[PDB]
Amino acid sequence: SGFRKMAFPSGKVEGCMVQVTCGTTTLNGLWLDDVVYCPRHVICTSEDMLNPNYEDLLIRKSNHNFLVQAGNVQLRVIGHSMQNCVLKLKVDTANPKTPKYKFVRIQPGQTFSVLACYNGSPSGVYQCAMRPNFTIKGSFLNGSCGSVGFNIDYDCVSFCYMHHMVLPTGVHAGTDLEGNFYGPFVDRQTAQAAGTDTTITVNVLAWLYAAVINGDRWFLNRFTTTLNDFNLVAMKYNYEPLTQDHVDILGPLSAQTGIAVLDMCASLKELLQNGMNGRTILGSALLEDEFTPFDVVRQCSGVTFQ
Amino acid sequence: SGFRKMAFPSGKVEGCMVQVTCGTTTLNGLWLDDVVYCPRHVICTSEDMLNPNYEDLLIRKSNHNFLVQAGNVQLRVIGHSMQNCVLKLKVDTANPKTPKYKFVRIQPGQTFSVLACYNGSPSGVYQCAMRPNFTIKGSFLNGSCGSVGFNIDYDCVSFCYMHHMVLPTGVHAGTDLEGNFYGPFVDRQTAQAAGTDTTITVNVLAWLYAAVINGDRWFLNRFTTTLNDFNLVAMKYNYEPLTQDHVDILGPLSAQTGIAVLDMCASLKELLQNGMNGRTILGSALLEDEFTPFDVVRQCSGVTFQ
Ligand SMILES: *[C@@](O)(c1nc2c(F)cccc2s1)[C@H](C[C@@H]1CCNC1=O)NC(=O)[C@@H]1[C@@H]2[C@H](CN1C(=O)[C@@H](NC(=O)C(F)(F)F)C(C)(C)C)C2(C)C
Ligand SMILES: *[C@@](O)(c1nc2c(F)cccc2s1)[C@H](C[C@@H]1CCNC1=O)NC(=O)[C@@H]1[C@@H]2[C@H](CN1C(=O)[C@@H](NC(=O)C(F)(F)F)C(C)(C)C)C2(C)C
């Protein structure tokens, strides 16, 4: 029983984490085959950061300027280049622990696991969601830069995120592993705020299905509603529109519980309108939106990896 | 920036997980050197579990009935003995990936990471607490038995929990790695109940301190209180009493915030009596008691491992 925010096992990724130093700046890098990936601002000092000229700072630099350490092993850089906001360092050793991997760009609402790192060493793991405003609600200190987010499919590690920065609200921003930002953010120290964040309705519904599977059923009402009427209400409350795709993704959970997605949609309509009256669902007193429908299925089926 | 329930990186433990089969009952095993630890009810069929005589059941068993899989590769069991409610299967191959490890019995209120496994394969990692009544609020499906809970100190893995059973409430119960239950439970299928569960006061205070460090300060008072006044409130709400040891344990957080423990107790007093009034704290609408003071120090100072 029970229902937790669960991260993927981190071992496959742990074996890929290294430390990259340029001058007096050190941050985390990701070592796959004979390439190390890190944030490009590794070449910046804390005063370059108001508005760097990366092309210019970079051209100055030579292979020998970049120190790569993997545990105790010093890695010899034999090449460097900049793709968007990431630096790729070609090294003389392929990482023997390199797992099957791919790089993906996740969409708003999708979850993944973060392995928070300081000085190339793993400190912690937790699950997050890409928020609709393209930020994440992570946990990161100074030196976290270059920590990575990922999903695991059996044996294939899909890397979706590398960490770059924290925004005034205390939420976070970063890139894909091709160094393109999620959202309209830039890698410089200047005024930038995320837009308004919305709640991810498809995930809330998934969460409500989890509750039902775990015996928490008090919020089921005898109404139903249409998708159009549902969405009119959800716009009112800063909830994301629900699509037909969302509906069909909820199917497994719908078929499991005997509860039509439009029925659950109606339970949710009432909760937004009248609130939760101090009552909890699965121990939470707020509606949770950082579990996808696949997340609920895996934790309510036993999906494993190796 | 940010406060999340963070788990320890799981790689060291992942390499120790095997699959243990006896009859057609399969569950999780922990392979350290040339010993594999699992729950002793691996030797039980369905009929046995209402009231097994483990001694008698085990006598009918022999090494030959014990099939240990380690990924794709079968392991030869050359020995066996029952230690309390756990089974020690001597195998022929020491585990090459054995980390430095110790076995510890944790106390109520202490947190640890769980690597949830099915069929000997990692599924997920998450953080929880030993509750005052010696249950945990985990996430476990059929086949989760023998999954383990752990802490990492630098390079040392301290194994503190092995999972055995779910209780009426949907809370879980298990043993240490020498097979002695946390709490009054037994490994048999009969109606058992945990005690009343209290809130871990020292952890709530640690979380409030995390709240202040992350800039969420609205619940601060200027009032104070003694330990005695506070305690005589606390027990009204089923908060565990707060001892001087707890005060001294909270002293790092106090010194970092500049807020005396007894002041913070005063803040918690008002919160217990006045409720939150629809206010959140670190984005929660309830008081969180599953972060120790050390946890708070770790994630607000960024301690690493491996
Ligand atoms: C990160 O780890 C990095 N730290 C350094 C560094 F010290 C020197 C050179 C390069 C880098 S990358 C760090 C992670 C931060 C620390 C606090 N919590 C985090 O998540 N990222 C940054 O310091 C980041 C880099 C410059 C300024 N950064 C910021 O996060 C700033 N925010 C903004 O400018 C805002 F996004 F607009 F709000 C800051 C310092 C928090 C105000 C750059 C963006 C390249
Ligand atoms: C666990 O994984 C094990 N499963 C088996 C099995 F199928 C055959 C033999 C041995 C074991 S151990 C499982 C974990 C449970 C399943 C559901 N959620 C979990 O956490 N543990 C049990 O099934 C466990 C074993 C017998 C009965 N168990 C219970 O958890 C039962 N509870 C109680 O008896 C009660 F707590 F008192 F209510 C049950 C089946 C959920 C009612 C034993 C303790 C030996």
B211 and B121 share a domain?
A: no
> CA-CA distance, B160 to B112, in Å (whole number)?
8
What token pair was written down for A203? 């995930």
Q: In this structure, which amino acid lies at residue B184?
A: P
> CA-CA distance, B216 to B114, in Å (whole number)?
29
B34 and B81 share a domain?
A: yes
Chain A nearest-CA distance from B113, in A, is 10
With beta carbons under 8 A apart, name residues in chain B contacting A283.
Answer: 137, 286
State which residue of chain B sits closest to A151, comparing Cα positions: B124
Residue finishing a domain among A73, A91, A109: A91
Return residues 178-237 of B near A (CB < 8 Å). Answer: 214-215
Which residues share a beta bridge with A182? none
**Whole-Å CA distances, A4 to A48, A210, A211, B67, B298:** 42, 11, 11, 32, 21
Q: In this structure, which amino acid lies at residue A285?
A: A
Cβ <8 Å between B305 and A4: no
> CA-CA distance, B226 to B242, in Å (whole number)?
11
With beta carbons under 8 A apart, name residues in chain A contacting B142.
Answer: 302
| Sequence-ordered alpha helix ranges (H) in chain A | 11-14, 54-60, 201-213, 227-236, 244-249, 251-257, 261-274, 293-299
Report if residue B4 sits inside a domain. no
Name the residue range of residue A266's domain.
201-299
Report if residue A216 sits inside a domain. yes
**Interval between CA B135 and ligand 2 midpoint (Å):** 14
Q: Which of A84, A66, A69, A77 is nearest to A25 (CA)?
A: A66
Q: In this structure, which amino acid lies at residue B123?
A: S
Chain position carrying tokens 């990259």 = A20
Q: Which of B271, B282, B137, B202 is nearest to A286 (CA)?
A: B282
Report if residue A2 sits inside a domain. no
**Whole-Å CA distances, B227 to A232, B200, B246, B260:** 52, 15, 11, 12
Chain A nearest-CA distance from B290, in A, is 13
Select from A6, A122, A300 the Cβ nearest to the Cβ of B126: A6
Q: What is the DSSP letter of A13?
A: H
Q: In this structure, which amino acid lies at residue A121?
A: S
Which residues share a beta bridge with B162? B148, B175
B235 and B293 share a domain?
A: yes
> CA-CA distance, A139 to B5, in Å (whole number)?
9
- With 0-12 CB in 10 A as exposed, 13-18 as middle and 19+ as buried, what is A83? middle
> CA-CA distance, B117 to A304, in Å (whole number)?
7
- Of the residues B16, B22, B38, B41, only one is catalytic, namely B41
**Whole-Å CA distances, B213 to A166, B3, B253, B259, B277:** 16, 10, 9, 11, 22
Side-chain-side CA neighbours of residue B249 (13 Å): 18
DSSP reduced 3-state for A286: coil
In this structure, what is the dihedral angle of CA atoms A82, A87, A88, A90, given to the nearest 10 degrees?
Answer: 100
> CA-CA distance, A44 to A82, in Å (whole number)?
14
Q: What is the DSSP letter of A258?
A: T
> CA-CA distance, B35 to B77, in Å (whole number)?
9
Chain position carrying tokens 């985990």 = B138
Q: Residue A59: which CATH number? A: 2.40.10.10
> CA-CA distance, B201 to B199, in Å (whole number)?
6
B209 and B285 share a domain?
A: yes
**Whole-Å CA distances, A137 to A165, A276, B27, B291:** 12, 24, 36, 18
Would an 8 Å CB–CB cutoff place B72 in contact with chain A?
A: no
Report if residue A183 sits inside a domain. no
Select from A138, A302, A303 the Cβ nearest to the Cβ of B4: A138
**Whole-Å CA distances, A125 to A3, A299, B113, B216, B266:** 17, 17, 10, 24, 34
Phi, psi for residue A301 in degrees, rounded to 5: -135, -40
Residue finishing a domain among A58, A75, A91: A91
**CB–CB of A112/A151 below 8 Å?**
yes
Give me the resolution in angstroms, 1 decimal.
2.4
**Whole-Å CA distances, B142 to A194, A226, B109, B159, B165:** 42, 37, 26, 22, 10
**CB–CB of B228/B89 below 8 Å?**
no
Q: Which of A92, A81, A97 is nearest to A37 (CA)?
A: A81
**CB–CB of A60/A48 below 8 Å?**
no
Report if residue A262 sits inside a domain. yes
- Tell me the ligand closest to B51's alpha carbon: 2
Chain position carrying tokens 């089969």 = B21
Residues in chain B: 306
Residue B202: Cβ within 10 Å count: 21
**Mutate which of B54, B189, B192 for ligand 2 pocket (most atoms within 8 A of beta carbon):** B189
Residue finishing a domain among A91, A125, A150: A91
Report if residue B33 sits inside a domain. yes
> CA-CA distance, A41 to A28, in Å (whole number)?
11
Select from A122, A139, A172 the Cβ nearest to the Cβ of B304: A122
**Interval between CA A165 and ligand 1 midpoint (Å):** 4
Q: Residue A219: which CATH number? A: 1.10.1840.10
- Of the residues A145, A160, A164, A246, only one is catalytic, namely A145
Q: Whose CA is nearest to atom 23 of ligand 2?
A: B165
Report if residue B231 sits inside a domain. yes
B127 and B206 share a domain?
A: no
Catalytic residue status for A41: yes
The residues, any chain, with a CB within 8 Å of residue B235's CB and separated by 6 or more, are: B241
Would an 8 Å CB–CB cutoff place A79 in contact with chain B?
A: no
Phi, psi for residue A214 in degrees, rounded to 5: -90, 20
> CA-CA distance, A83 to B196, in Å (whole number)?
57
**Whole-Å CA distances, B91 to A57, B37, B44:** 58, 11, 21
Would an 8 Å CB–CB cutoff place B146 in contact with chain A?
A: no
In this structure, what is the dihedral angle of CA atoms B262, B264, B270, B273, given to the nearest 10 degrees?
Answer: -80
End-to-end CA distance of chain B: 23
Q: Whose CA is nearest to atom 42 of ligand 1?
A: A189
Catalytic residue status for B41: yes
Report if residue A133 sits inside a domain. no
Chain B nearest-CA distance from A1, in A, is 5
* Residue-wise DSSP of chain B: -----PBPP-HHHHTTEEEEEETTEEEEEEEETTEEEEEGGGG--TGGGGS--HHHHHHT--GGGEEEEETTEEE-B---EEETTEEEEEBSS--TTPPSEEE----TT-EEEEEEEETTEEEEEEEEE--TTS-B-----TT-TT-EEEEEETTEEEEEEEEEEE-TTS-EEEE-TTSPBSSS--SSSS-----PPPB-HHHHHHHHHHHHHTT--TT--S----HHHHHHHHGGGTBPP--HHHHHHTHHHHHHHT--HHHHHHHHHHHHHH--SS--BTTBSS------HHHHHHHTTT----
Domain total of chain A = 2
> CA-CA distance, A99 to A112, in Å (whole number)?
17
B67 and B105 share a domain?
A: no
